[PDB]
Symmetry: D2
Subunit: 337 residues, 4 copies
C-alpha cells in the first residue's frame, strides 16, 4: 500500500494512516469560557468520519490569560473535562485517534488586562507591552501545563502536543530576540530551553503516552533562532522522551518568509536526520502525491494538513483517489465513497 | 451571478442558494428507538457549515412499523421532539434551512411482525407478504402523518417533505401495480391518489409552511405509472397547495433503469412546465456546471444532491469554484476557502 | 458503455465517438492567400491524436471577399486543394473523421474594398455599409459554395458543413432584420430561405456525403428570428436531405445574451424533436457528465466542443475518466493514458 | 512569480520557464529509416503551442544498429537534417527551445543482426548476447556521437543531451555489472568513464552550446553503480563543461525499484549539492505544486515531465492554474486559455 495509508505506532498508540489534522483555532467559544460548542463538535467529528488518522484539537489555553482570543478553547479548568470527554469519545468512535495542543499565547494574547512574557518586549507596534513573568509565575505556568496534561488524560486524549511555536509563550523563552532574562530562564541555550525542559518533565509525571512538541524551526531573522538551534533543542527533547517534533516556523516577530508548497519540509527532514527524531511535516501540503513523496523520501513521519482540510474535510478520500489506492469508507457512506 | 447561488423564496422561507442535501438514510439509530445520535448531528451540521442552502433530514417514520429498518430515525413519538429541536437549532445557527422527510415504508419495511400495504402483494420473492390495510388503518395512518407534521413544526423545521416515492406506502397506493383495492382508496386514479390527498389536507391543518412531496415519476414497468400519470398528480397537488415536487423515480418493483448523469431531470422539467409546479431535480448531479444548466434552462427550481455530498460535504464551495464565482465561507474557514 | 463513446453512423460515415471539435478560426494564414500553414497542421492533427471523433476545420471562405479576416483559410481556389488533401490524410491516419465549414462572411467581412450582403445595412456603427448583392451576384455565390464543395470532396473531407450562422452571409439572408429585399430572395420566409435552399441543392449535385448546416437558432432580438422560425427551416432542410443541424445562436446584430453551461442546448433539443432532425449541441459544454446527459436525454446526437478543446486537446481522455470508462489511446501514448 | 515560470539562462540559451518535455520514444518512424513523420511533427509542436519551455526530442540513434527499435528516430545520416530543420524551426516559432537526445541502445537494441556492447553479456534471458566492441569500434562510436552532434547543430537544435542512462550503450560502459573489459575502457572508474569522457570532449569540438547528460543515478543492484558513483562522475562532467545532469535511474538490468511521486528527486538533489552541477529532476512529477516545491527547496534546476505531458500536452497551463498564477497563452488560443 501507499505509505500515506500505512500504520505507525507511537508508544501504545497505532495510527491507521499518516494524515494528521493540524491544530487550527476556531475562535468559536462564544461564551468566553473556553468551553466547546456544537460547532466544534461537528467541525472535529466530521474529519473523523472523513478518516483522518489523527485529529489534533486547536490551541487550548492552560491559563485564561494565555488565550490568544477570548473565544479560544481552554483546558485550564476541570469544568473543561466533561466537554472534551464527549469529543474524544465521539472522534474515536468514528475511527480516529485524537490529540490536544496545550498552549499559552504569552505576549501575543489579545486580551484585556496584563499579558505575560519572558521579557517586557512587545510583539509589534500594534500590541501591548507584556509584563515580565516573575520566576514564581514562570514556575506556576509550568505547573499549569502539567495540570492541563492531567485534564487531557482524564478527558481521554490519545496524544498531547505542547505548543512551543508561532511566537507564543514557550517560543518567546526559546528565542534571544524575545528573551532578555537575567535569571535561570534566560541567556545560554540551556537557560532559554529550561522552561520547555521543565514543562516536558512535569507533563511526563502525569502523562506517559505520545508527547509531541510543535516548534517554529526558524525565526527568519538576524540574531534569532534558525534550524541549527532547533536541531540542538531537538536532541535535548529526544533525551527527555518527546516522541515527535511537529515542524512549523515563524511568527515570533514579523519577517519576510518565502511561502510555497512544502516550504517547511526541510526543517522536518533535517531534525529527523540530525536529531534521530520522528517528525511531522506541515505547510502548504495540499495533495496526496506530495504527502506520499515526503514520506517515501524520508523527510517526515506524519503529514500535517491544515487549510486543505478546511476546504475538503474528506481529504483522505481525495488523496487515496489521487494515489490510485483504496481505503475503508465510513460505513454510512458506502454507496457514495 | 450564478443562478445556483442566487436566493429563492418559498412561502416565508428564503434559501440562500439552490443546493439541497437530498434525504439519505444513515441507519444509525442504534438503540432502535428512532432517536438521533451524535453521528447524525455531526453528519448534518457539517453540511450546514458547508453552506448547503437546505438540508433535508432522512426518511423519518411516522409509525414504528413504517420504518425501513430498525435503525431508522423516527418522528412517531413526542419523545423525538427534543432531539430534533436541538438539530434544527444547530443547523440553522450555521446558516442553512432544514427540512424533514415524513415516511412510511409500507411493504418494503424490513421489520419483524406484520407489515402493511394497500394490497397483500409482496415487493419481491425475498419479502414478506404485507397485510392489506383496513380503511380504518389507512385513516389512522393519515392521522399519523398529521401528528408527525405537528411534531416537526414544534421541533423547528422550516420545510416538511412527504415521502411518496421509492416504492414505499404512498407510492404503493398510487400505482395500479401495487394497489388492487376496490374501496375508496383504489380503482380510479382519483381513488389511488386519495391517500396522498388526505395526507396533504391533514398536514395543512397543522402546518402552513413550505410543503414538498417526493415522487417516483415512473415505475419503468408496463401497466405501471409513467410521467403522464405524474403530471396529472402534480396538477392535483398544485391545487392542494403543495409548493414543490422533488422528482425521483423507480423502486416500486424491480425494473431495468438506465442510469446516467441527470437521468431524472426530464421528469422535473415536464412536471414543471405542464403542471406549472416548482420542481426539485435529483439523480447523478455531481458538479456545478450541470446544476447551473438545469436551473438556467428552466428544468427545475432546486438542485438536490445526494451521493456527491457524501464524497464532498463542501460541494457548495467546489461548485462555486467550478463556476468561477464567489460565495460566503463559514467565518471559521475564511483563511482556507 | 457511455453513449458519448459509442459509435454513430451518418450516411456511409461512422464516427468512433460523439465528440466533435467545433470549427474555430485560427487567423493563421499569414500570407493572406487562404492557405494552410504548419501551425494549422499541428493544431488539428493533435486533436486527432487526442481521439476526437470528428474534427471540423474552421470557417473556410468560398470567395476571397467572403473571408472574415485576411488571415482566414480559404477554399475558393484549386490551389487550396493540395494543402487540404495533406491535412485530411494526416487527420484520418491518426484515427478521426474530418469536415470543413464552407463560409462567406457577408457584411461582417473585415476586408478592404466592397463587402456584400442581401441588403445595404451595416452590422454596426464601426462597420462598412455592404453592397446589396444583385440577383446575379447571389447566383454566382451559390455556385461558389458548389465549387468549394467539389474541392472539399477532392481533398478528401468526410463531412461538409454549411456556415449559415453567426450573422454571416446566409444568416443575413434568413433574417428579416438584415434582409429587406423585394425580389425572389426576400420577403416571405420561403424567399429568405431560398439562398440556403439553392446552396444545399447545388452542393448535393457534387457531394453525396454527410451534409451539416450550422445555424444561429435565435437572433435574441425583437422582430428577428427565434427558435420557432428555425424549427420551420429545419423541416425544410430535412426534406432537402441535410443530415444534421449544428445549433448555435446569435451574432446577426449586437444583443444581450445570457450565457451559461448548455445555453444553446434547448435549440438542439427542440429542432431534434419537432423537425425530426439529428442535431449537434454546442455552447459552454466542458465536461463529460454534461455531454453524456445531453445525449442520453435525447437533446442532441453529437456534442460539439470548442474552447475546452483549446484548453485540453485531449478532452476525450479527460471525459472518459470523468465518466469512469475506458477508451482506446493512440498507440504511442499507451504508457501514459 | 513562481519559480516554475521564472527564466533560466544556460550558456547563450534562455528558457522562459522550467518545464522540460522529457525525451520519449514514439516508435513511429514506420519507413524504418529514422526519419520524421507527420505524427512526430504534431506530437512535438503541440507541446510548443502548449508553452513547454524546452522540448527534448526522443532518443535519436547515432548509428542504425544503435536504435532501440527499427521504428526509432535517427540522426546517423545527413538525410535526417532536413526533417529536423523543419521541426526545430516550427517548435521555436511557437515559443519554445528544443533539444535532441543522442543515443545508442547497445545491448538493448531490439534489431536483427549483431548488436554491440562493452562486453558480451546479455541484458536478460530474453535478449541476444551482444558482440564485444573492438577498441576500434568504440572509437568509431565516439566519432558517431560527434558527427551526430554536428548534424544537430546544423538542424538548429538549441540543446544536445547525451543519453548515458537506462541500460543503453554508455551506461553499459559506466557500470561494473555490464563492463568486464580489460582494455582502456574497463576496470577503474576512470577507465569505465573514458567512453563518456571522449564523447563529451569530441562533441565539444563541434558544439559549444548547452550540453546535458542523462544518467541512471543508480543500478539498484549489489555491486552495481549507486549515487556515490554518480556524484563522482558528475564532478568529472562539471570539469569537462557539461551544463546539466538529467537525473534518471535504473534499467541496466532488471531490479526492484520502489516507484512513487518524486522517487528520483534525491539523486538530482545530491548531485546538485555535491558536484555543484545544475540538475534536471524527473520521475512521477505530475503537478505544478510538486514542481514548484522541487525548485524552491533547491533540489533541481529544471523539471522534466514525461507521462503527464502525454496525458495533458498543455500541462504548463494546468500547472499555472494549480499555482494560481498567469502565463502567456499561445495567441491563437486567447479566448480559451
Ligand atoms: C484558521 C487557522 C487557525 C490556526 N490555529 C493554529 C493553532 O491553534 N495551533 C497551531 O499550532 N497552528 C495553527 N494554525 C497553523 C496551522 O496548523 C498550520 O500549521 C498552517 O496553516 C500551515 O499548514 P497548511 O498550509 O496545511 O494550512 C492555524 C491556521 C489557520 C488557517
Ligand atoms: C445511503 C443512501 C440513503 C438514501 N436514503 C433516502 C431517504 O431516506 N429518502 C429518499 O427519498 N431518498 C433516499 N436516498 C436517495 C437519494 O436521496 C437520492 O435521491 C439518490 O441517491 C439520487 O441522487 P444522487 O445521485 O445525487 O445520490 C438515499 C440514497 C443513498 C445513497
Ligand atoms: C477562437 C474562436 C474561433 C471561432 N471560429 C468559429 C468558426 O470558424 N466557425 C463557427 O461556426 N464558429 C466559430 N467559433 C464558435 C465556436 O465553434 C463555438 O460554437 C463557440 O465557441 C461555442 O462553444 P464552446 O463554448 O464549446 O467554445 C469560434 C470560437 C472561438 C473561441
Ligand atoms: C513511451 C515512453 C518512451 C520513453 N522514451 C525515452 C527516451 O527516448 N529517452 C529517455 O531518456 N527516456 C525515455 N523515457 C523515460 C521518460 O523520459 C521519463 O524519464 C520517465 O517516464 C519518468 O518520468 P515521468 O514519470 O514524468 O513519465 C520514456 C518513457 C515513456 C513513457
Amino acid at each position: 500500500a501507499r505509505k500515506l495509508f500505512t500504520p505507525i505506532t507511537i508508544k501504545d498508540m497505532t495510527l491507521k494512516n499518516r494524515i494528521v489534522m493540524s491544530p487550527m483555532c476556531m475562535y468559536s467559544s462564544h461564551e468566553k469560557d473556553g468551553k466547546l460548542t456544537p460547532f466544534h463538535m461537528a467541525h472535529y467529528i466530521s474529519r473523523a468520519i472523513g478518516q483522518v488518522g489523527l485529529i489534533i484539537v486547536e490551541a487550548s489555553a492552560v491559563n485564561p490569560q494565555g488565550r490568544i482570543t477570548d473565544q479560544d478553547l481552554g483546558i485550564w479548568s476541570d469544568e473543561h473535562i466533561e466537554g472534551f470527554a464527549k469529543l474524544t469519545e465521539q472522534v474515536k468512535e468514528q475511527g480516529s485517534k485524537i490529540g490536544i495542543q496545550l498552549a499559552h499565547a504569552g505576549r501575543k494574547a489579545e486580551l484585556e488586562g496584563d499579558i505575560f512574557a519572558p521579557s517586557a518586549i512587545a510583539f509589534d507596534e500594534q500590541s501591548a507591552t507584556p509584563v515580565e513573568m516573575s520566576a514564581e509565575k514562570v514556575k506556576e505556568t509550568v505547573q499549569e501545563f502539567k495540570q492541563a496534561a492531567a485534564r487531557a488524560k482524564e478527558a481521554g486524549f490519545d496524544v498531547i502536543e505542547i505548543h512551543a511555536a508561532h511566537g507564543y509563550l514557550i517560543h518567546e523563552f526559546l528565542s534571544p530576540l524575545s528573551n532578555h532574562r537575567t535569571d535561570e530562564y534566560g541567556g545560554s541555550p540551556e537557560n532559554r530551553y529550561r522552561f520547555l525542559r521543565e514543562i516536558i518533565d512535569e507533563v511526563k509525571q502525569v502523562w506517559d503516552g505520545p508527547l509531541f512538541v510543535r516548534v517554529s524551526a526558524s525565526d527568519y531573522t538576524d540574531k534569532g533562532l534558525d534550524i541549527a538551534d532547533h536541531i540542538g533543542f531537538a536532541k535535548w527533547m529526544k533525551e527527555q522522551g518527546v516522541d515527535l517534533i511537529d515542524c512549523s516556523s515563524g511568527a515570533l516577530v514579523h519577517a519576510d518568509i518565502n511561502v510555497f508548497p512544502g516550504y517547511q519540509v526541510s526543517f522536518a527532514e533535517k531534525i529527523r536526520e540530525q536529531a534521530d527524531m520522528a517528525t511531522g511535516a506541515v505547510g502548504m501540503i495540499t495533495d496526496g502525491s506530495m504527502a506520499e513523496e515526503i514520506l517515501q523520501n524520508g523527510r517526515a513521519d506524519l503529514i500535517f494538513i491544515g487549510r486543505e482540510l478546511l476546504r475538503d474535510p474528506f481529504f483522505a478520500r481525495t488523496a487515496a483517489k489521487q494515489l490510485n489506492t483504496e481505503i475503508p469508507a465510513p460505513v454510512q457512506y458506502e454507496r457514495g465513497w
